[PDB]
């Protein structure tokens, strides 16, 4: 395309806001640049931050997988909002409540595991006993030292 149709600097005047909106196939009322904070957006339109998953499935999109129409301005973050990536659709449960219940469940389970490690379950049984000085030789003990004798008795 020609240079007059490419993105430009932040629009300073209403005449430049009308040229930018026309360039991007938008209504001047709907056209809103990003704030002119020196971050490099220029006059590229600021579009609502919504996933493509949020668009009407039943409409005849020119790009059905992307749910875009040929010629419509694409969101700055279009590639992050494809249907394979970030979803922003409404949830049945409020976001803040969702976080509270997930975190609360996890924190409680972690707390209860610490308690269960403090008060372990076990059977009313004495230690298992092994012969030959507690299998000293079998477990790799040095054969050149006489081990501290371990004696197990009957009962």
């Amino acid at each position: 395309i020609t240079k007059d149709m490419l993105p430009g600097p932040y629009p300073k005047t209403p005449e430049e806001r009308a040229a930018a909106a026309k360039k991007y196939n938008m209504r001047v009322e709907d056209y809103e640049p990003y704030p002119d904070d020196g971050t490099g957006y220029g006059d590229y339109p600021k579009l609502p931050d919504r996933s493509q998953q949020e668009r009407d499935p039943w409409y005849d999109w020119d790009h059905p997988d992307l749910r875009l129409n040929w010629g419509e301005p694409m969101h700055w973050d279009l590639d992050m909002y494809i249907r394979n990536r970030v979803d922003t659709s409404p949830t049945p449960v409020n976001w803040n409540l969702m976080c509270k219940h997930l975190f609360g469940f996890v924190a409680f389970m972690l707390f209860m595991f610490w308690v269960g490690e403090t008060y372990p379950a076990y059977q009313p049984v004495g230690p298992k006993q092994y012969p030959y000085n507690n299998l000293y030789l079998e477990r790799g003990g040095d054969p050149n030292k006489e081990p501290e004798p371990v004696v197990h008795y009957e009962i």
Partner: protein, 171 residues
């Protein structure tokens, strides 16, 4: 057979004799006989044929012997001609020492598998021999870096020898 039994030892094999305490036939026994007839026999004949061809063309190859040259200890500094030979020798001995540690590691791994659940006690000799050889290899070659050389190996040895002298001086 093919390899030296001394370099790669293997304890004597003790297979128990069959002592069937069941009237049933052993499926493995008849499978073994079928394997000998249908696999081992035809394979053996094909090999015996190939060995008849190799005996008609018998020729030899040799193991290269490397005469010893002076070490880097005997080289005057910046004397490249003597440094080169000592350096090449040191690199040959470095590769051989790597293979020595591999032989000792292969003994250790063979013992662990062979001894089964009794390996912790029946492989104590191989563990000890592996520990000693790895200690020696570490002293010679560890921490030299990618640009290792006989010169760097000597400096590492001298540093180690100096510390040993000082520790004795404490005694």
């Amino acid at each position: 057979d093919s390899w030296d039994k001394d370099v790669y030892p293997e304890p004597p094999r003790r297979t128990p004799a069959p002592s069937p305490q069941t009237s049933l036939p052993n499926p493995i026994t008849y499978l073994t006989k079928a394997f000998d007839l249908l696999v081992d026999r035809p394979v053996t004949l094909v090999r015996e044929f190939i060995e008849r061809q190799h005996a008609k063309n018998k020729y030899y190859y040799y193991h290269r012997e490397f005469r010893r040259v002076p070490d880097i200890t005997e080289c005057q500094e910046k004397d490249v001609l003597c440094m080169f030979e000592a350096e090449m020798q040191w690199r040959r001995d470095y590769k051989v020492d790597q293979e020595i540690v591999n032989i000792i590691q292969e003994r250790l791994k063979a013992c662990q598998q062979r001894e089964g659940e009794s390996h912790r006690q029946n492989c104590a000799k191989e563990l000890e021999q592996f520990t000693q050889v790895v200690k020696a290899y570490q002293d010679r070659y560890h921490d030299l870096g990618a640009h290792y050389s006989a010169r760097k190996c000597l400096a590492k040895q001298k540093q180690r020898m100096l510390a040993e002298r000082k520790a004795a001086k404490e005694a």
